[PDB]
Tab-separated table of C-alpha atoms in Angstrom:
chain	number	residue	atom	x	y	z
A	1	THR	CA	-132.931	-28.686	-14.435
A	2	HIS	CA	-131.622	-31.280	-17.403
A	3	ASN	CA	-133.435	-33.904	-15.156
A	4	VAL	CA	-136.410	-32.427	-15.788
A	5	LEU	CA	-136.219	-31.591	-19.644
A	6	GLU	CA	-134.411	-35.448	-19.586
A	7	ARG	CA	-137.427	-36.914	-18.492
A	8	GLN	CA	-139.763	-34.848	-20.765
A	9	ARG	CA	-137.587	-36.122	-23.835
A	10	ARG	CA	-137.871	-39.624	-22.729
A	11	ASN	CA	-141.632	-38.904	-22.395
A	12	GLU	CA	-141.702	-37.626	-25.947
A	13	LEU	CA	-139.565	-40.564	-27.256
A	14	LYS	CA	-142.077	-43.313	-25.707
A	15	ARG	CA	-145.360	-41.460	-27.165
A	16	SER	CA	-143.520	-41.516	-30.481
A	17	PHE	CA	-142.519	-44.991	-30.723
A	18	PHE	CA	-146.446	-45.883	-29.254
A	19	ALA	CA	-147.758	-43.758	-32.755
A	20	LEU	CA	-145.704	-45.434	-34.329
A	21	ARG	CA	-146.139	-48.502	-33.128
A	22	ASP	CA	-150.052	-47.897	-34.090
A	23	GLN	CA	-149.615	-47.624	-37.527
A	24	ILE	CA	-148.285	-50.629	-37.921
A	25	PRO	CA	-150.996	-53.919	-38.159
A	26	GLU	CA	-148.701	-56.387	-36.871
A	27	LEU	CA	-148.139	-54.583	-33.782
A	28	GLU	CA	-151.242	-52.462	-33.794
A	29	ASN	CA	-151.630	-51.916	-29.623
A	30	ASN	CA	-149.150	-55.211	-28.922
A	31	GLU	CA	-148.636	-53.593	-25.723
A	32	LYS	CA	-146.060	-55.371	-25.068
A	33	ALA	CA	-143.475	-55.034	-28.248
A	34	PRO	CA	-139.904	-53.629	-27.393
A	35	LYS	CA	-138.674	-50.595	-29.028
A	36	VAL	CA	-136.444	-53.202	-31.443
A	37	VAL	CA	-139.385	-54.869	-32.811
A	38	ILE	CA	-141.200	-51.801	-33.037
A	39	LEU	CA	-137.914	-49.951	-35.469
A	40	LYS	CA	-137.437	-53.011	-37.284
A	41	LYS	CA	-141.337	-54.000	-37.880
A	42	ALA	CA	-142.066	-50.194	-39.284
A	43	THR	CA	-139.095	-50.665	-41.581
A	44	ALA	CA	-140.461	-53.775	-42.656
A	45	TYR	CA	-143.838	-52.573	-43.274
A	46	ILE	CA	-142.388	-49.526	-44.628
A	47	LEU	CA	-140.497	-51.344	-47.499
A	48	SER	CA	-143.913	-53.569	-47.763
A	49	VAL	CA	-145.600	-50.074	-49.062
A	50	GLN	CA	-142.914	-48.718	-51.383
A	51	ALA	CA	-142.729	-52.122	-52.994
A	52	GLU	CA	-146.792	-52.499	-53.248
A	53	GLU	CA	-146.568	-49.005	-54.918
A	54	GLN	CA	-144.408	-49.657	-56.870
A	55	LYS	CA	-146.244	-52.589	-58.082
A	56	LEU	CA	-149.915	-50.796	-58.493
A	57	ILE	CA	-147.879	-47.743	-60.534
A	58	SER	CA	-146.890	-50.931	-63.243
A	59	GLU	CA	-150.427	-52.198	-63.282
A	60	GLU	CA	-151.786	-48.808	-63.534
A	61	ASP	CA	-149.570	-48.667	-66.230
A	62	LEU	CA	-150.562	-51.682	-67.879
A	63	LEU	CA	-154.113	-50.764	-67.798
A	64	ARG	CA	-153.969	-47.730	-69.495
A	65	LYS	CA	-151.777	-49.110	-72.436
A	66	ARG	CA	-154.597	-51.327	-72.846
A	67	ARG	CA	-157.531	-48.751	-72.436
A	68	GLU	CA	-155.715	-46.857	-75.132
A	69	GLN	CA	-155.635	-50.969	-77.254
A	70	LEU	CA	-159.068	-50.936	-76.760
A	71	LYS	CA	-160.161	-47.594	-77.576
A	72	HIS	CA	-158.041	-47.675	-81.146
A	73	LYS	CA	-159.426	-51.077	-82.041
A	74	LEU	CA	-162.886	-49.598	-81.513
A	75	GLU	CA	-162.086	-46.772	-83.456
A	76	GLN	CA	-160.627	-49.332	-86.113
A	77	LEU	CA	-163.788	-51.387	-86.348
A	78	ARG	CA	-166.114	-48.760	-86.312
A	79	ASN	CA	-164.087	-47.125	-89.054
A	80	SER	CA	-163.955	-50.295	-90.980
B	1	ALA	CA	-123.161	-58.847	-20.611
B	2	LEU	CA	-126.686	-58.505	-21.885
B	3	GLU	CA	-127.746	-54.541	-22.124
B	4	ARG	CA	-124.507	-53.011	-24.633
B	5	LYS	CA	-126.095	-55.157	-27.567
B	6	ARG	CA	-129.233	-54.426	-26.785
B	7	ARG	CA	-129.086	-50.857	-27.536
B	8	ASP	CA	-126.813	-51.706	-30.241
B	9	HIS	CA	-128.962	-53.167	-31.830
B	10	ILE	CA	-131.932	-50.144	-31.330
B	11	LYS	CA	-129.279	-47.826	-32.529
B	12	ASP	CA	-128.943	-50.191	-36.099
B	13	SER	CA	-132.791	-50.306	-36.330
B	14	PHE	CA	-133.050	-46.817	-36.223
B	15	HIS	CA	-130.571	-46.127	-38.906
B	16	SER	CA	-132.646	-48.405	-41.193
B	17	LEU	CA	-135.796	-47.487	-40.049
B	18	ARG	CA	-134.794	-43.734	-41.154
B	19	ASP	CA	-132.776	-44.760	-44.402
B	20	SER	CA	-135.813	-45.987	-45.491
B	21	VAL	CA	-137.824	-42.934	-45.163
B	22	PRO	CA	-137.183	-40.918	-47.892
B	23	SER	CA	-137.800	-37.481	-46.444
B	24	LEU	CA	-135.256	-38.458	-44.080
B	25	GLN	CA	-132.686	-38.863	-46.871
B	26	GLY	CA	-129.159	-37.235	-45.716
B	27	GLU	CA	-130.949	-36.269	-42.587
B	28	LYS	CA	-128.747	-36.749	-39.477
B	29	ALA	CA	-132.148	-36.935	-37.472
B	30	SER	CA	-133.192	-37.437	-34.134
B	31	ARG	CA	-134.709	-40.517	-32.939
B	32	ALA	CA	-138.029	-38.541	-32.292
B	33	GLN	CA	-137.966	-37.001	-35.884
B	34	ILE	CA	-137.159	-40.471	-36.986
B	35	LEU	CA	-140.150	-41.865	-35.172
B	36	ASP	CA	-142.456	-39.066	-36.360
B	37	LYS	CA	-141.258	-38.751	-40.037
B	38	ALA	CA	-141.511	-42.459	-40.432
B	39	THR	CA	-145.319	-42.443	-38.692
B	40	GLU	CA	-146.380	-39.867	-41.335
B	41	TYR	CA	-144.430	-41.533	-44.156
B	42	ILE	CA	-146.430	-44.571	-43.440
B	43	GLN	CA	-150.097	-42.591	-43.526
B	44	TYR	CA	-148.601	-40.542	-46.538
B	45	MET	CA	-148.279	-44.077	-48.201
B	46	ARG	CA	-151.354	-45.973	-46.951
B	47	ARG	CA	-153.941	-43.319	-48.588
B	48	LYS	CA	-151.632	-43.456	-51.977
B	49	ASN	CA	-151.679	-46.899	-52.336
B	50	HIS	CA	-155.433	-46.968	-51.877
B	51	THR	CA	-155.637	-44.226	-53.808
B	52	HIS	CA	-153.847	-45.897	-56.814
B	53	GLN	CA	-155.740	-49.215	-56.037
B	54	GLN	CA	-158.992	-46.924	-56.949
B	55	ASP	CA	-157.623	-46.070	-60.665
B	56	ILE	CA	-156.919	-49.020	-61.017
B	57	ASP	CA	-160.312	-50.594	-60.351
B	58	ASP	CA	-161.806	-47.675	-62.293
B	59	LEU	CA	-159.705	-49.037	-65.544
B	60	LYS	CA	-160.799	-52.547	-64.980
B	61	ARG	CA	-164.381	-51.134	-65.404
B	62	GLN	CA	-163.365	-48.635	-68.014
B	63	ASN	CA	-161.539	-51.444	-69.702
B	64	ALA	CA	-164.242	-54.330	-69.335
B	65	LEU	CA	-167.038	-51.683	-71.059
B	66	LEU	CA	-164.134	-50.935	-74.005
B	67	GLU	CA	-163.943	-55.130	-74.564
B	68	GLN	CA	-167.910	-55.601	-74.795
B	69	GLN	CA	-168.090	-52.668	-77.593
B	70	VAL	CA	-165.357	-54.410	-79.102
B	71	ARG	CA	-166.827	-57.179	-79.119
B	72	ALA	CA	-170.817	-55.943	-80.136
B	73	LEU	CA	-168.920	-55.371	-83.354
């Protein structure tokens, strides 16, 4: 009874591993990637997209400050 | 002796993965939930980084135009 429910959790965990692996560019459909590689590579990839998000927010903030600087300069020239 | 070390690496790597997923913060999630939440978070972050990169491209185009308006004066 618990033996059939046990294999059902094992099957769902296996599918969960594949779905995670399918999200990692370095592992995408790498058929034989073991469990500990999927975990470690998923962690590394997650940290990379968090670092990327921080970089883009920073770039975006600078561009917006440059935009306001440029608009102020344009307005100053038009009124001088 | 090679099997207990390998499952101890699995356990540590599950903990590290779980700790990197913000929605799992302070949750003793199951292994299946850790995997599913990390998959969903990766998909959410990929879209969010794509949107940010498109906003950046827009700002670069606006700024290049503005600088041309400035230089024309």
